[PDB]
Structure 1
């Protein structure tokens, strides 16, 4: 078989705020010239947030899709495909967020009187950037549940963009499932102080989650069990907490129970919303996708504190990602792992970071469950080092010059399309990165040639019981990686 079979597509995220808070597509002209540069560089497509907070601003079911329709049109004119994010979260308190885009005011208004719709930490601070999983099924939003809101939104998107969908412009739908659109709790909120090097805090203190937990422990036979009170604060180090130190809580009957409860809430959150998405896009030629954050800090200590915390119950003897991947399999969905570029050697030593190991674990898990795996770089990078790292992860075993590679990622979405990217020296480098992703082939407009034809979305396969999902916690050995890519940028 042909080299083309080694091609991994490359997408570029558009600027945050290309459609502003007023639901105005600001500067089509400017964007156009940028897109035109990407098309000439060989870029396959672009990625864009479809802000819930801009679209359904006015009131329940009051959608205005017009500015996004103009944007999609322009993208289509430029010869690019598109990955659309159903962004149900706020833009603003996370790294890189240069524009503030909140969730719908009308939802914020309800929150003014029911503060428990937001993720809450132990001190009672409410995070407004995303609705707590606790209200997924509470019919408190003018008669609707949170899940119904998301569902109606994606139905409306489908119907109103049907022309673009049927013309094959949209290739994937990324379903926003938490802060930054990631399936995770907001355990590391910059808006609350949290400084990169730190463990984060558990976010299950709203009343709904707290009631759920209390009932569950009672059913387990331990009504007296409480939510964690010895876990420390955002910038703690594990050893300094009662929860995470060795022989700490987190290895106690109660701790295991809580951790399982806390991580399973995400699993179920993701599973139910994907169900709604699968129904909304049923029959369309798109793939569904979710985003999983890459929390590499503390990975190298037994407690994996930052990962627990974020809701990923991942230890050295309990695979907390594979279950996600298994969950995604019934929906035929892609696991978009949002950190690909980092090297262990670039992290401060005291962070106990294992970015490369984390990556091998998460991808392998996906490949092992037989789902498609994609990813993004986490921070803005313009150097060959970064690029070669992404290329290695894209094809961990190198290129197969006589067939499809044994392992390959389904796609990579580079982090943001800025002036910087476009500067002469930086752009020259990017161009090579694109070439190497493409396995030295020219841009290939018809993805069928490289075994990426998109078929009409099928209905999800039947529910997998939590017990079965939880079987995927069994640790496995990762697939083997080359030390270096066989296709470098230099």
Structure 2
């Protein structure tokens, strides 16, 4: 079989704020000259936040889709496809966030009087960037639950954008499930003083999560068990805590129990909302996708602290990503792994960082459960080094000259299209990165040629019970990676 079968598409995130808080598409002319450069480079499509807080600003079910319609139209004129994020989170407190976009005021307003709608840490600090899982099903938002708000929103988006959908502009709907749109707890909030190699904190202290946890321990036989109180603070290192030190609480019956409870809330949160998404886009030619954060720090210690606090119950003897993938399988969704570029040696030694190993684990787990895997770079990079790492992850075993590769990612969405990227030398490198993703082929407008035809979304398969999800915690050996890509940019 031909070469084109090796092709891996490349998408480019649009600038934050392209449609501003006031629901105004700010500078079409400018964007337009940018997009035209991307089309010339061979870029397949672009990715954009569809901010909940801009759209449903005025009041419940007061959507204004107008400015996004304009943007989508301009994208379509430029010959590019589009990845749309249902961004139900706030823009501002995370790395790179240059614009502030909060969640809806009417929701914020409720929170002034029910503070427990937000994620809360042990100290009682409310993080307003995303509604707590604790309220997925509480009918406190003027009669709706949070999951109903998201579901209504996606329905609305589907009806109002049906022409773009039916025209094949939109290729994938990325469903936002937490801060930065990722399925995770906001355990490393810059806005609270968290700093890089920092362990982060559990975020289950809001009233609803807490009561749920209390009732669950009581049913387990230990009504007396309580939420972790020996985990430390944002910037600790694990050895310095009772929870994460060796032989600490995390390996006790109660730590295990808490941990399982805490990581299960996410799996469940993701599964219920994807259920709604599936129903909203049923029949549309689009794939659904979720975003999983790459938390590589502490990966190389037995306690995987940062992962744990973010809600990924991953250890050396318990695969805590594979279960997410198996959950995605019923929805036929793509796991978008948000960190792909980093090399272990680029990390401060004191972080016990295992970015490359984390990647192999996560993509292997995906491929093993037979779902599609995509990903992004976590930080801005312009060098061949970044690029050649993303290319290797894309096709871990190199190109197949006589057939499709045995392993390949479904797509990669590069981190942001800025002036910097478009500067002459930077851009020249980019163009090569694009070319090698495409396996040296020219940009290929019909994805069916490279075995990416899109079909109408089917209904999810049936609910997989938690037990079964949790079987996927059995560790497996990763697939073998080459050491260097066979398609270097350099």
Deviation at 1:231, TM superposition (A): 0.1
Deviation at 1:380, TM superposition (A): 0.2
SS at match of 1:390: helix
After superposition, give the CA deviation of every residue in 1:43-91 in whole Å (9 maximum; x if it has no partner): 0000000000000000000000000000000000000000000000000
Distance 1:331 1:196 in 2: 34
> Map of 1:75-474 to 2, 5 A cutoff?
75-474=75-474
Deviation at 1:370, TM superposition (A): 0.1
Distance 2:256 2:197 in 1: 25
After superposition, give the CA deviation of every residue in 1:17-64 in whole Å (9 maximum; x if it has no partner): 000000000000000000000000000000000000000000000000
After superposition, give the CA deviation of every residue in 1:86-140 in whole Å (9 maximum; x if it has no partner): 0000000000000000000000000000000000000000000000000000000
SS at match of 2:247: coil
Deviation at 1:423, TM superposition (A): 0.0
The runs of 4+ residues in structure 1 deviating greater than 3 Å are: none
SS at match of 2:448: coil
Deviation at 1:382, TM superposition (A): 0.1
After superposition, give the CA deviation of every residue in 1:367-391 in whole Å (9 maximum; x if it has no partner): 0000000000000000000000000
Distance 1:95 1:485 in 2: 29
Distance 1:428 1:350 in 2: 35
Distance 2:231 2:196 in 1: 18
After superposition, give the CA deviation of every residue in 1:423-465 in whole Å (9 maximum; x if it has no partner): 0000000000000000000000000000000000000000000
Distance 2:70 2:196 in 1: 38
Could you list the runs of 5+ residues in structure 2 that have no partner in the other structure?
none
SS at match of 2:449: coil
Distance 1:93 1:105 in 2: 17
After superposition, give the CA deviation of every residue in 1:144-179 in whole Å (9 maximum; x if it has no partner): 000000000000000000000000000000000000
Distance 1:246 1:205 in 2: 25
SS at match of 1:306: helix
Deviation at 1:13, TM superposition (A): 0.1
Distance 1:82 1:240 in 2: 46
Deviation at 1:271, TM superposition (A): 0.1
Does 1:49 pair with 2:49? yes
Distance 1:324 1:331 in 2: 11
Distance 2:182 2:443 in 1: 30
Distance 1:371 1:138 in 2: 32
Distance 2:279 2:195 in 1: 40
How well do the aligned residues superpose, as a CA RMSD in angstroms?
0.1
SS at match of 2:488: coil
Deviation at 1:198, TM superposition (A): 0.5
Deviation at 1:142, TM superposition (A): 0.1
Distance 1:421 1:294 in 2: 23
Deviation at 1:284, TM superposition (A): 0.1
Distance 1:53 1:210 in 2: 27
Deviation at 1:197, TM superposition (A): 1.3
Deviation at 1:288, TM superposition (A): 0.1
Distance 2:350 2:31 in 1: 42
Distance 2:291 2:483 in 1: 26
Distance 2:331 2:118 in 1: 28
SS at match of 2:199: coil
After superposition, give the CA deviation of every residue in 1:374-421 in whole Å (9 maximum; x if it has no partner): 000000000000000000000000000000000000000000000000
Distance 1:441 1:205 in 2: 52
SS at match of 2:209: helix
After superposition, give the CA deviation of every residue in 1:181-205 in whole Å (9 maximum; x if it has no partner): 0000000000000001100000000
Distance 2:350 2:127 in 1: 28
Deviation at 1:216, TM superposition (A): 0.1
Distance 1:181 1:60 in 2: 21
SS at match of 1:431: helix
Deviation at 1:335, TM superposition (A): 0.1
How many residue pairs match? The answer is: 490
Distance 2:90 2:301 in 1: 32
After superposition, give the CA deviation of every residue in 1:336-387 in whole Å (9 maximum; x if it has no partner): 0000000000000000000000000000000000000000000000000000
Distance 1:427 1:3 in 2: 25
